[PDB]
């Protein structure tokens, strides 16, 4: 085929329309569905695919017990077309407790991290075969975007972090051509902690709105140029910070160059993208927990520091329903690049003690230039009807 170039202008976005939903947990109560966590969506030139880090077991299984651990040898990257639930026929494309997948227009590239926490191996699988691999350069938990990577003209950039989750970690941007690591640029700029980046193509560059797990409740931005392999980094300018935990809307802040040091000890994977000078950002409705999910546009939120003027707010998941990792992915339209996002709806441990398992279902929204209504799309599974 032909390499994806992403050389189209960003699509006109007035909001996000519902696109897909797997109902994984609801189907798990009477079917054989994989236990999954940290899902993401990536699209071929033809169709879009779900991805998730399966826990090596199904829900109606004795091994689903104690599935809240992030890194086990049995975790694998599941893969099927968007909408198809993760049933027993799902293809496990690699062993990974951390993953990232992009389609360069010709073949799939999967970056899969597995192994020991302190000696992890990151395998680069392109076109169904292992092409490259790297080891942990910091001898800590080597991790990656946990979302789709972006290939521009055949060069796929993946953001790999290695180091403390609550301190200074070494983040490197790896440039991958047909599975081979052709360049490795260290993270540069004013972002002090970069982890779980939601990358989207901004030609000729790649923009990654990452998660600051150390000090910032404002998401760091990593701009990556796929031509000269140059990295710059800053923080999202909007005063409506998109990382939970966070302060409430009145007291939150962001000044585009430093973490705000407001409830930044933890974080959730999230997304943001610039509609010109505005920012379209999704965040959990609850400030402290991953409960609910909303998306809105902050006027001048990508340029003006501490901008709190929001518009076009949509409630994706209502306040009283659990959410989780969110992320972005891009679809190449007829003449314009559409920005779509997904929300992971985590159910089970540790928040819900009725069951012994931790799993999730995904819901996907695509940006639209037309009109839309309202509604909430939670997981919908009754935890009392689910197997323990």
């Amino acid at each position, epitope marked *: 085929a032909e390499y994806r170039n992403w050389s189209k*202008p960003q699509c006109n976005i007035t909001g996000f329309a519902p696109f897909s939903k797997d109902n994984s947990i609801r189907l798990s109560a009477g079917g054989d569905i994989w236990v999954t966590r940290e899902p993401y969506v990536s699209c071929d030139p033809d169709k879009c695919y779900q991805f998730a880090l399966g826990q090596g077991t199904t829900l109606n299984n004795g091994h689903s017990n104690d599935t809240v651990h992030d890194r086990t040898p049995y975790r694998t990257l599941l893969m099927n077309e968007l909408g198809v639930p993760f049933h027993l026929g799902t293809k496990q494309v690699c062993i990974a407790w951390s993953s990232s997948s992009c389609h360069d227009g010709k073949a799939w590239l999967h970056v899969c991290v597995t192994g020991d926490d302190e000696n992890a191996t990151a395998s680069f699988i392109y076109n169904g075969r292992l092409v490259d691999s790297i080891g942990s350069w910091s001898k800590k938990i080597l991790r990656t975007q946990e979302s789709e990577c972006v290939c521009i003209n055949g060069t796929c950039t993946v953001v790999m972090t290695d180091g403390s989750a609550s301190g200074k970690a070494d983040t490197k941007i790896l440039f991958i051509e047909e599975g081979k690591i052709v360049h490795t640029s260290p993270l540069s700029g004013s972002a002090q902690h970069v982890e779980e980046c939601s990358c989207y193509p901004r030609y000729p560059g790649v923009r990654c709105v990452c998660r600051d797990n150390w000090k910032g409740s404002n998401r760091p931005i990593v701009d990556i*140029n796929v031509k000269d392999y*140059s990295i710059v980094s800053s923080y999202v300018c909007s005063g409506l910070v998109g990382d939970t935990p966070r302060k409430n809307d009145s007291s939150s802040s962001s000044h585009c160059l430093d973490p705000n040091n407001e409830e930044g000890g933890h974080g959730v994977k999230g997304w943001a993208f610039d509609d010109g000078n505005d920012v379209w950002m999704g965040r959990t409705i609850s400030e402290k927990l991953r409960s609910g999910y909303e998306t809105f546009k902050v006027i001048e939120g990508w340029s*003006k*520091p501490n901008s709190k003027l929001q518009i076009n707010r949509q409630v994706i998941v209502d306040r009283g329903n659990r959410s989780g990792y969110s992320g972005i992915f891009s679809v190449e339209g007829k003449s314009c690049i559409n920005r779509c996002f997904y929300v992971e709806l985590i159910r089970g441990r540790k928040q819900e003690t009725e069951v012994l398992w931790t799993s999730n279902s995904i819901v996907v929204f695509c940006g639209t230039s037309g009109t839309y209504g309202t509604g909430s799309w939670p997981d919908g599974a009754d935890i009392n009807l689910m197997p323990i």
Partner: antibody
Framework: QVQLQESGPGLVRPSQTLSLTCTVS??????????WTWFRQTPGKGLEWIGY???????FYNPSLQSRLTISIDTSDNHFSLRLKSVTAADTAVYYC???????????????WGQGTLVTVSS | SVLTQPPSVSGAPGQRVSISCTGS?????????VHWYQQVPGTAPKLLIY???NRPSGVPDRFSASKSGTSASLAITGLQPEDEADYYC????????????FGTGTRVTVL
């Protein structure tokens, strides 16, 4: 050959919106391999980079002025524009429209320039 | 931020002069290419050197450039008339975002 021609009002009141347009001749701005750049040179200082853009609309702005400007593109009329908000006595300068060599960032030099328009902010 | 240059550098015809641009950690000292622009006052700047020495076209062989560490130098050999202009060193700055820093501006005055 690429020819750039700045065109905009020469006098803008303070706290108004400065708007300049650079018309490009001899080349198409609709090919996304060049950055269509804006510069300004205050009389007492050197050149200052204002912002970037290409035909696709992926713009980069000077972090100092980033809160104000908006660099737009128009592939139909074959021109790109600059829009500075809330101008002051520091915004009076000679504004140059230029084209970068390529679409990189670290390896960028601006060979093709405009003629330069004197924009004065005063009353 | 900006790069620094001597405010003025003079020189008689025939001899040579040097313009010293000094960078920083997110600057000339980060390995980014240094480009030199010649601007006769009142007119548009003209690109003189790129790649720290790659005189594009129609540029006299008098001008030479060299980068070392966090400093870069532009050498004019000959100091002929019509070389009386402002010379600016441009470089890429990545401390905050995509940024391009110019030199303070050296005025070459051929006595």
């Amino acid at each position: 050959q690429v020819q750039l021609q700045e065109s905009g009002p020469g006098l803008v009141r303070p706290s108004q919106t400065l708007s300049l347009t650079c018309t490009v001749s001899g080349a198409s701005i609709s090919d996304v391999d060049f950055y269509w750049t804006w510069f300004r040179q205050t009389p007492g200082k050197g050149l200052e980079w204002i912002g970037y853009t290409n035909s696709i609309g992926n713009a980069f702005y000077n972090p100092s002025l980033q809160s104000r400007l908006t660099i737009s593109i128009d592939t139909s009329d074959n021109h790109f524009s600059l829009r500075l908000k809330s101008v002051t006595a520091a915004d009076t300068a000679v504004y140059y429209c230029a084209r970068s060599n390529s679409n990189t960032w670290s390896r960028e030099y601006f060979q093709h320039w405009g003629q330069g328009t004197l924009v004065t902010v005063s009353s | 931020s900006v790069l620094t240059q001597p405010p003025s550098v003079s020189g008689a015809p025939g001899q040579r002069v040097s313009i010293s641009c000094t960078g920083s950690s997110s600057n000339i000292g980060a390995g980014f290419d240094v480009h030199w622009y010649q601007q006769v006052p009142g007119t548009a700047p003209k690109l003189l050197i790129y790649g720290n020495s790659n005189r594009p076209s129609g540029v006299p062989d008098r001008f030479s450039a060299s980068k070392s560490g966090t400093s870069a130098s532009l050498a004019i050999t000959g100091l002929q008339p019509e070389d009386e202009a402002d010379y600016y060193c441009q470089s890429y700055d990545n401390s905050l975002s995509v940024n391009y820093v110019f030199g303070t501006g050296t005025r070459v005055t051929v006595l």
